[PDB]
Design a binder for this molecule. Structure first.
Ligand SMILES: [Ca+2]
Ligand SMILES: [Ca+2]
Ligand SMILES: [Ca+2]
Ligand SMILES: [Ca+2]
Lengths: 272, 272, 272, 272
């Protein structure tokens, strides 16, 4: 029905979403992740949060190296997690599940995010109205410097070999928490949104409506209290605003570059 | 009736679901697990949780090696289990048992998960309405780095031999807790869901309905209290949110890769 | 009337259900246990519970070796029994005794589990309605690594000799507690289930109904209190949730592998 | 519908918005970022905030170098964050989403800033009236001195090579916090603005209206309290006015120069 382009791609495979990973763009749009196996020059990475250890060098770009560097940087002295990078929060209405990927911002498997069936005629909401409140807090980012020679490859000649398989290397990874409290009801949206806002900022619709809660990151003790009612979600948001070495966060978003002109990559996702 | 594809396959055989295990894809879809017996290069693994011991090397990928590495990593100093990875929770409606595998996310033996008969005309629920509340908390993951040479095999020539038997190696394993409180009743869903939500967030339908509770992982002391009523399940969820070395968790989900292009593997399960 | 296939076979002969035991599949389906007498390569075993002693090596697979290894592993330091592996609990209805083996999950001798006669026309319940509440707590498992050379035999040539007698070696053994409180009554199921649930979560039907209690494992002091009423069974479940070296548990379930392709074995049991 | 030119471009890619970065102007207007890979002379940078370490020299202009220099300058002695650089705050009305980029000041992806769809006929607001209160606090800036020889390149001859690809180097980067509390309602603007101003400076419209909150920078503890109501946003503004080394701020605005005559660059963005 529509197509959307975004530069901040959502983290669908954490095993393969690491700094310096090179992947084909068509595969990323398809939601696959096909790596381009070629040696890379040593890369330089920097951290948004202030600490005595910000600049790091990685000889071999790998997820283990990225995780170890993040751990040591956040364990370094003079580290402050009091300031975050961004905090988005919105209560919107959805009538299809395929359009719920707009909230995430890129191509996602909603059928696995929420234990539902979407294929076929089930893309429409079972109930009458579908509302959802979503929040996304970005604490810090790891960003990688552009290549000194203009090519990320170590031989500087694999670009000619990689024709047809468009190289695209991950340049940035965003760490933070995410949460959605999707609600399906048979009442009117004017009252469903009123009840949702009252519950979040403080009766029968919220008790007769279908709930679908999905949380990424954050304190587990606060996250598990969501089942206790609508105060649990607001406590999961209010608490844990400041990130600590104990609770760094889970990679939620990542940015990509074209590996040829080193420009930014815009993923494309279609919504029906 | 329908087919679904998912990248996070559910752990059906814990004995064979270990990091680096190579298995045929057709067998995994069939729910069998046929290993590809061939030497593998030493692998590098990383842990989602922050600790002084994150990066590990495994010469021979095996379940005992994975378990020992997980134990030593979680016993290492500067370990924090306060932050989890994900927390999904939903109360949905099911009218068949074969479609209950949507909640798990992959092909499962519901006939062995719940002590029922599904084969034949028994796939439909015995009672009128079937509801179920399910929760899944993912605490941490072990993820393995992509091969440096692009091939996971140690001879780099077994790929030619393994034609027809599509190699697929386990790249990630998810640790966490899972729980379902499936309920069958003769009343209306509008009241059954209301009663379930009231019991979880706080009378005759819940006492005259058929119960089916299935829990994976978590504290045993909290899990055994589920039989005491509906407060036991909510206490099993609320308590044990933060994972500790005493209670690491049971592997619930795992991701797979194609071992030829090192892309992600999407398992396929049909629902009738 | 129906046939069922399951991968988690129930422990019918504890003397012969040990890790590494090789038995014919036809015999296991028949409920016999015919060993395949052939030397085996040394095997590696791992334990689900966290302890300083997880990985063990067994030169000669035997029940005494398995028991000694389990004892020493659970007596090792840094052992935590606070987390279990699974906890299933369901209150179902049965109208035949042959179909009561669905609750166990494999072929069992119900005629010896409950001191009744099933052969002939006695397979039906004597009373009008038959209900049963069953619980199964799995604390930990011992699992054995796949053979390095792909063959479990020590000569690597006994596979050719073992044709017709399909080799099947036990790969995993599950330790835990089990319990069933089978009830036969002349009233309606809608009231029998109500009374059972009220008694378990807290009058004449439960006192005029026929009782059949079967418990495997758990604390003996709590198990013997079942005869005192319906609070004894709920106390046997609530207490002893956390397993200790004093009360490890009895092998209740075991998994098997085909010893040729090392795939998982699915036992088949028919229900009439 | 209209075109606007501004000299303070908004930070859309923090990974590529660093001091000394050279990018094509057409790409910046397109919202792409294509770097001009050429060696640069060592640059001199200065900091708006008063500290013992103000003047810095950067041999290789990179994001990691800029971040490290900012960290060390703000950690230097005799640093005062009591005085900021600017504080803009306005409550305006918007009837389209494409015109909401006027508040930011340059070309932005409103479709990713707010989880909405804009492409096609959805550019209009779903509700009747659209109001928004926005605040932007600029604490300090890093500014780079003009080249001594009049050319930023290190060979002083790459200007002839870079014809057609108009070089444009980032000269200044603004650090600060930003926030918008966009509101959609069905009432009249005369009452919606009244309610918004009363809530910010202190009932049914604000509870039945659709909320869209977007915050960049600032204290996370204060930012997460926005969900609690309208006092959270006013507390996020009132608190954290003075910037500290613990909470420096996120780059929100940057200025650019033409790299040929060293004049200021005016980006152009169209609004429909
Ligand atoms: Ca290079
Ligand atoms: Ca290899
Ligand atoms: Ca052998
Ligand atoms: Ca120059």
């Amino acid at each position: 029905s529509s197509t959307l382009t975004s530069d901040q791609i959502v983290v669908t495979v954490p095993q393969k979403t690491f700094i310096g990973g090179v992947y084909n763009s068509t595969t990323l749009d398809n939601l696959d992740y096909t790596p381009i196996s070629y040696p890379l020059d040593p890369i330089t990475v920097s951290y948004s949060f202030p600490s005595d250890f910000i600049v790091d060098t990685i000889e071999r770009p790998s997820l283990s190296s990225m995780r170890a560097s993040v751990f040591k940087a956040m364990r370094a002295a003079n580290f402050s997690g009091e300031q975050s990078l961004a905090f988005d929060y919105n209560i919107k209405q959805f009538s299809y599940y395929s359009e719920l990927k707009i909230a995430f911002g890129s191509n996602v498997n909603i059928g696995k995010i929420f234990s539902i069936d979407i294929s076929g005629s089930n893309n429409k909401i079972k109930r009458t109205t579908g509302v959802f409140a979503k929040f996304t807090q970005k604490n810090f980012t790891i960003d990688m410097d552009l290549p000194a020679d203009g090519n990320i490859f170590k031989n500087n000649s694999d670009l000619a070999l990689t024709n047809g398989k468009n190289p695209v290397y991950i340049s940035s990874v965003t760490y933070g928490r995410l949460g959605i409290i999707s609600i399906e009801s048979n009442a009117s949206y004017n009252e469903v949104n009123f009840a949702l806002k009252a519950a979040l900022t403080a009766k029968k619709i919220l008790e007769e409506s279908d709930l679908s809660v999905y949380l990424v990151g954050g304190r587990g003790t606060d996250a598990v209290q969501v089942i206790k009612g609508f105060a649990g979600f607001s406590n999961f948001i209010v608490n844990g605003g400041q990130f600590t070495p104990e609770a760094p966060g889970v990679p939620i978003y990542f940015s990509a570059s074209h590996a040829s002109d080193n420009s930014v990559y815009y993923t494309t996702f279609t919504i029906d």
